[PDB]
Design a protein around this ligand. Structure first.
Ligand SMILES: [Co+2]
Ligand SMILES: [Zn+2]
Ligand SMILES: [Zn+2]
Length: 264
């Protein structure tokens, strides 16, 4: 396994973990977004960072006063090394069930060596095998929390978002953990031959994502939802700073124009 060169220091830069809304917490790096969802029956972790991120993740969970041994479920939005780098390790240590969008099961099982965009040069992250293959609109229940997986292909063949309700003592929130449909290739869709449905998948995702409704959206990278504009370490609890429909729409507009060009 050889993790590709990382030029962006913020991918490994530690960041102080915080509560976003209800039982949703941010436990990722300065730019690689990882989430903890805490329930009465244990916890869900969504994403890791790079290979070395396992230490920070364990520490972040601890720092919020939760227990790593309460981890029951592992999810990802995206089978790329920047979001699955430490997943094999976290799964080993926790013994949690990994649930994955069927579209990415294969790439995950080979550590990214069959990746349509970065394949052919061996494993880019430690292979993981999912205990559950999820399809569009499958639900994941733990205690009183229920997640809906949304198949949002294109970024990866199985990239996906999660839609779920949480509550604090005053209010309930509909949260989208979105995988934004960014384009990873530099060439035209028509030339990406080992992913024949790539253009149709982007078209489907862009349309499906525009029509979603929620109170709060977050993304796979902190920068993609401007997390550092909405929250500083020490802010305390403030779900409302993550209410940002305009931000979401502006982002999908940009990604729509990108889709039209075919690349970046
Ligand atoms: Co299936
Ligand atoms: Zn990616
Ligand atoms: Zn990424």
């Amino acid at each position: 396994v050889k993790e590709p060169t990382v030029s962006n220091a913020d991918w490994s830069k530690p960041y102080r973990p915080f509560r976003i809304a209800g039982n949703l917490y941010y436990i990722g790096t300065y730019d690689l977004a990882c989430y903890l969802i805490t329930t009465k029956q244990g916890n869900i972790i969504v994403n890791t960072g790079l290979a070395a991120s396992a230490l920070q993740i364990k520490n972040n969970i601890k720092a919020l006063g939760f227990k790593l041994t309460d981890t029951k479920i592992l999810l990802t939005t995206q089978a790329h090394y920047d979001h699955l780098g430490a997943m094999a390790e976290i799964k080993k240590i926790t013994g949690a069930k990994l649930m994955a969008d069927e579209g990415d099961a294969t790439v995950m099982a080979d550590g990214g060596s069959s990746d349509y965009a970065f394949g052919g040069h061996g494993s880019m992250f430690e292979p993981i095998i999912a205990d559950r293959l999820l399809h569009d609109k499958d639900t994941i229940q733990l205690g009183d929390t229920k997640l809906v997986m949304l198949h949002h292909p294109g970024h990866t063949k199985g990239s996906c978002s999660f839609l779920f309700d949480t509550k604090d003592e005053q209010r309930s929130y509909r949260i989208l953990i979105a995988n934004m449909p960014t384009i990873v290739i530099e060439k035209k869709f028509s030339e990406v031959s080992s992913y024949p449905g790539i253009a149709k998948d982007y078209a489907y995702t862009l349309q499906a994502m525009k029509n979603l409704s929620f109170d709060i959206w977050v993304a796979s990278h902190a920068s993609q939802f401007s997390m550092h504009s909405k929250h500083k370490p020490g802010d305390g609890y403030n779900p409302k700073s993550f209410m940002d429909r305009k931000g979401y729409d502006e982002s999908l507009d940009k990604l729509q124009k990108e889709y039209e060009k075919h690349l970046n």
